[PDB]
Amino acid sequence: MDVFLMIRRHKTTIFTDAKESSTVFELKRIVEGILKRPPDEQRLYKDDQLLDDGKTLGECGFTSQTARPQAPATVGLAFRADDTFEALCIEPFSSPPELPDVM
Amino acid sequence: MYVKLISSDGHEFIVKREHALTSGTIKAMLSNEVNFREIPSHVLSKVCMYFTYKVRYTNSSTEIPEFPIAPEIALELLMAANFLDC
Amino acid sequence: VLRSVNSREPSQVIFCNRSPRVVLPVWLNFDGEPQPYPTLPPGTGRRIHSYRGHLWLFRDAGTHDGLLVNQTELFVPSLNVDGQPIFANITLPVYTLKERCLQVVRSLVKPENYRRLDIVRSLYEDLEDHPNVQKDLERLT
Ligand SMILES: CC(=O)N[C@@H](Cc1ccccc1)C(=O)N[C@H](C(=O)N1C[C@H](O)C[C@H]1C(=O)NCc1ccc(-c2scnc2C)cc1)C(C)(C)C
């Protein structure tokens, strides 16, 4: 079953899908293909939880019924700057305006 | 193959090329990064979700859920969809 | 053009509302006039008696947004094989992002106020041009 994801770091957001049965490491390989940084230089997170390479996305709570096309689940990303890993940091999206009166 | 769509506040959304070609406007701007000076991230993120939704549920027998739009973003989203022709 | 044929050959049908909308079935009568039938709440079904060669289409009962029946616009009951009813599966289409936005805006702004919204005139017109069965009958013709 497909899960639909947003992989987020700083002001970058990747929209992609993966199998529930695929692994965290395999998701790093996908990020590698896009952002050109190897898996050993990536940490992936569900909220503040560091995800282990050998776990399946399903095990880590990304399921086909919650990680939906129209409402994808967020996976946090942090890169290793040279020696040590930066802290997970995801820039929020902008804020919508106040509802007008007429609405 | 992916393209980068950049919001007016500098958010970089990386989505599959074929998904982004849902918008004829984006096709033209490509024909592989596009800046959108009038589309903020809270709108453009939703547009990307729309692409994913459309591609997934077009020509599909499995029942179709409603594409959700918060009241707060509906106006700006309308304006983006009109510009993007999607 | 789009009118039911007066066949007299009965046909049992299950109207199955697999959409989140309240649904309005519309029968095109023998003169091509749309004739509204009782609504179906979201997720519900009705066993109904119709006839072969009769034309139906389905709409959101509140807003008249177009719905699909068995993946197309129109439904014509056919011959029942071995006494089994014909299924009419009513579903949401995949709306364009624009039409979906227009739906949500329409559902929040009273028509009198469309002029107050800060948008290009052409979107005012788009909002005001509500989904309408008569219009679609001309579009299908
Ligand atoms: C005068 C007559 O009975 N004519 C037959 C044809 C016929 C049959 C026998 C002999 C001669 C002619 C005929 O075509 N009838 C038509 C008829 O019965 N119709 C038109 C459509 O095919 C549906 C059917 C009909 O009204 N069926 C009753 C019905 C009642 C409710 C509902 C619905 S729809 C959503 N919920 C419900 C409960 C759906 C169907 C009417 C009476 C509307 C003209």
CATH code of the domain covering residue B60: 3.30.710.10
- Which experimental technique did the depositors report for determining this structure? X-ray
Residues C104 and C139 in one domain: yes
Residues C62 and C97 in one domain: no
Q: Could you say which of B58, B77, B85 has the minimum Cβ distance to residue C101?
A: B77
In angstroms and rounded to an integer, the radius of gyration of the C-alpha atoms of chain C is 17
Chain B neighbors of C98, CB-CB under 8 A:
78, 81-82, 85-86
B2 touches chain A (CB under 8 A): yes
Tokens 């695929």 belong to residue = A22
Residues C61 and C96 in one domain: no
Resolution (A): 2.1
Orientation of helix B74-84 relative to helix C121-128, angle to 10°: 100
Q: Roughly how many angstroms between the first and final C-alpha of chain B, as a whole number?
A: 21
Distance CA A69, CA B49 (A): 6
CB atoms within 10 A of CB A23: 19
Distance CA C58, CA C23 (A): 7
Number of domains in chain A: 1
**CATH code of the domain containing A33:** 3.10.20.90
Q: Which domain holds residue A9?
A: 1-103
Put simply, the answer to whether B42 touches A96 (Cβ < 8 Å) is: yes
Number of domains in chain C: 2
Residues C87 and C133 in one domain: no
**CATH code of the domain containing C52:** 2.60.40.780
Sequence-separated (6 or more) residues with CB below 8 Å from residue C31: C3
Residues C86 and C97 in one domain: no
Strands ordered across the beta sheet of C23-28: C34-36, C23-28, C55-60
Chain C contact probe: residue of B77, B82, B85, B86 with most C CBs at under 10 A: B82
The string over C60-87, giving b where at least 16 C-beta atoms fall within 10 Å of a residue's C-beta and e elsewhere, is bbeebbbbbbeeeeebbbeeeeeeeebe
DSSP letter string over A1-28?
Answer: -EEEEEEEEBTEEEEEEEETTSBHHHHH
Residues C42 and C68 in one domain: yes
Residues C69 and C48 in one domain: yes
Task: Looking at the complex, report in whole angstroms how far the Cα of residue B4 sits from the nearest Cα belonging to chain A.
Answer: 9
Q: Which amino acid is at B48?
A: C
Q: What residue in A sits closest to C106 (Cα-Cα)?
A: A103
Sequence-separated (6 or more) residues with CB below 8 Å from residue C47: C12, C13, C14, C85
Distance CA C69, CA A36 (A): 46
Pairing of strands A2-9, A73-81: parallel
How far does CA A33 lie from the centroid of its chain?
Answer: 15
3-state secondary structure at position A43: strand
Q: Which domain holds residue B39?
A: 1-86
Q: Which domain holds residue C129?
A: 92-141
Among C residues 68-87, those touching chain B with beta carbons less than 8 Å apart:
71
Among B residues 21-80, those touching chain C with beta carbons less than 8 Å apart:
47, 50, 53-54, 57-58, 61, 63-67, 69, 71, 74-75, 77-79
